[PDB]
Amino acid sequence: HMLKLIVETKTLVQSLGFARSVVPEYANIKLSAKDGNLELSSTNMDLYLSQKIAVQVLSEGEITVSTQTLSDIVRKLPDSELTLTELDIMKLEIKGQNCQFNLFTLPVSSFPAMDSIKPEVSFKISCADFAKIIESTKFSISLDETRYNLNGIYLHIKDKEFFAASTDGHRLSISWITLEEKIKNFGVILPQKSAEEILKIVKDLKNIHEDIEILLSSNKIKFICNENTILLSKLIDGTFPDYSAFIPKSSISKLVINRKIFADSIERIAIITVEKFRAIKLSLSRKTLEISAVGEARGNAKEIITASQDKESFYEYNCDESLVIGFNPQYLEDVLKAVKSNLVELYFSDISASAPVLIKFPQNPKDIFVIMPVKV
Template structure:
C-alpha cells in the first residue's frame, strides 16, 4: 500500500476512530486501526468488540492495499505534524512495516496482519429510518446527562430509544435515568421507525455518535435490530452492540398530578442556583428552595463554609413550600432548557418534581428532592 493524504483530513478521521480504541487491552490487534486504501479513498476502521467505527477520506492511492497500525501512536504522530502538510504512507511488502513521511520527518511503525483484525458482524438490521442531525442531537443532549454511571445497574448505563404515543401523535422517544433524575425527549416518529424494539444505547456509543453529529449536516440513517444498532453518516459508520437488559417502566415515576406550579426565568434562576451552591457542601450539593406567592428564595448552608441566601421573582400562587434539591442535578436540567421560562410542578417536599420548558413540551425532566 502506498498513498498520499492531507494531514487535516487524516487527523480528523484518526481523532474519531482512535477514541473508540481502549487504552488498555489484552488483545494487541484491538489497539490498532485498520487502514485500507483503494479507488481514491482511505478507510479507517477501529473496534473494541462492542463498538465499531468505519470512516473514509479522500486520498491519492498510488498502490492499493491494507494494514493495521497502532491507533493512538499514529494519531499522536499526525497531530504533531505541521498544519497544511502532506502525509505519505507506505507499507513495505517484505517486512510489513508502515513508513510515514511528511516533510523531513520519517516514522516507522510495526504493523499487525489485516487478517487478525476482527469483523463486528452486522447481521440483519431489519428496522431503518433517518433523522436529521438536529433531531438526533436534541435527543442525545437532552437526555445523556442523566445516564447512570453505576455499573451494577448496567441497564441504566445508556439511553433507552423507542417508539411511543406522544401527546401530538407517534414519537421517537429517548429516556435516561440514574435513579435521582430522569430525562425524556422526543421527536416526531420518522418513517420506518414504527414497531422498532425498545433498545438501550450504551454510554460510550452515545458519546462517539455525539462527536460525529457536530461535523455532520443533513440526515443520519439509523438501522437496528434487537441486539445491534448502526448510525450511518456521510463518510462514517458506527455499529454498536446494545445493552442486553430491560429498561424500567419510567412512566410510573413521572407524576401527573403535581399541583404546585412555579414559573421562573430559566437563565436568572440557573445563575442564582450556581451562586448559592458555592456554599453547599461538596458531598451533598444541597440547596433549599422556599416558595411563597410571587417569590422564590434559594438558600444553602454548610458547617465549613457558612450560608447563602438569594431571592428571585417567580410566578407562584400555591401554598408555601420548602423543598431541597441537589444543585448539580438542577443545573444539568436547567442547562437543557433553551427557552426563557422553566416550569416546576411539585406536590410536596418528598415527591418527585417535574421540570419542563414552557414553550417546548418535547422534553420533560423529573428530579427527586433532597432532605435539607
C-alpha cells in the first residue's frame, strides 16, 4: 500500500502555502492518498490543519515529508501536473516531465493525529461574513503578553448574534453576524495566530463564496471551511472583559466625513510626530476640520478640511460648539482601513476631550469601534 497520485501543480502549491503558514515533528507534513483525494495534515503547538484536495489516486497510502522542502520544490516546477510516488526505501519521488526529486520520508507513525472536540455549540456562517468580523477585529488585539486574555479575538454567541471582539485597552473593535436559529450563549478566545490562519483560509478564492462551520467548546475551537479544510485550534485560557460598559450610550455631537480624505490626511499629518507623542489633534467646527500635529525637535503640521455635502469631499459637524480632541493616529487609521465605506462617523459622548469616541461606518451597521482619545 504505497502512495501514488497525480496532482495539478497549482492546486498543490496553494495547499502547501497554507501548510507553511502553520509552522521536530512540526517541520513535517503528512500526505494521505485515499478515496480520490490527497489529505495534507500540518500541526504546531496550537493548530492542527487538515486539507483535502481532489487528485488522481493511483495507489492509496500515506507518507510524511519536510514541509519546507516539498513546498520549495513544488512552487518552482513548471509542469501543470506532478506525479508523487512513495518508493520502497522511505523516499517520495516527485516527477515532472523532465525532472525528478527524491525526498527522504519520515515514519507516518511518528506524526501526531488530530485531537477531538465535544462542542457546546455549532453553527454555520458564510466565509465572507466570517472574514469580515475577523478583518474588523484582528488589528486591535493586545500584543502585551502579560494581558494574556486580551491577546486574541473574543468569539461569542449572545442572543442571536455571533460577535468577534478585541481590545488592547486603548481601542475596542466589535463586528457581528446574525444567526437565524436559536443557539445557546457561548464564548471562546481565539489566539492571534489562529485568527490569522483561518482568515487566510476563508479568503481563498475557492472558499470565499462558500460557508464555514464553527464548533466551540471550553478548550478548543474547530473550523470546517467549505467541507474540505479543517482547522482545530487551542484557545486562550482567560476571561474576556465585559466590554458592553465601554460602548457610549449617547452622543452630544457627531462628525461625518469622507473616509478616504480623513484617513489620508491623518496619515500625512502624523508623519511629523515622534514615538514619545504619537498623537494628532482634531479641531472640529461647523465650517472646517483642522487636523494638526507636533513633533519635538521635528516640527508641526496642519491640514484644513472644509464643510461639504458632496460625497467625495464630505465633511459636516452639525454643532454650534467647536471641539478639540486628540487620538493616536495609528489607532484611527486601523479603524478607517478596516471597513471599505465612503463615509465614517465619529460620535462624541460629551464636551470633554477624554471620553471614549464611537466610530461607525454608514452602510455597515454590524461594526462598532471605540477609541480612547489622547491628551493634546
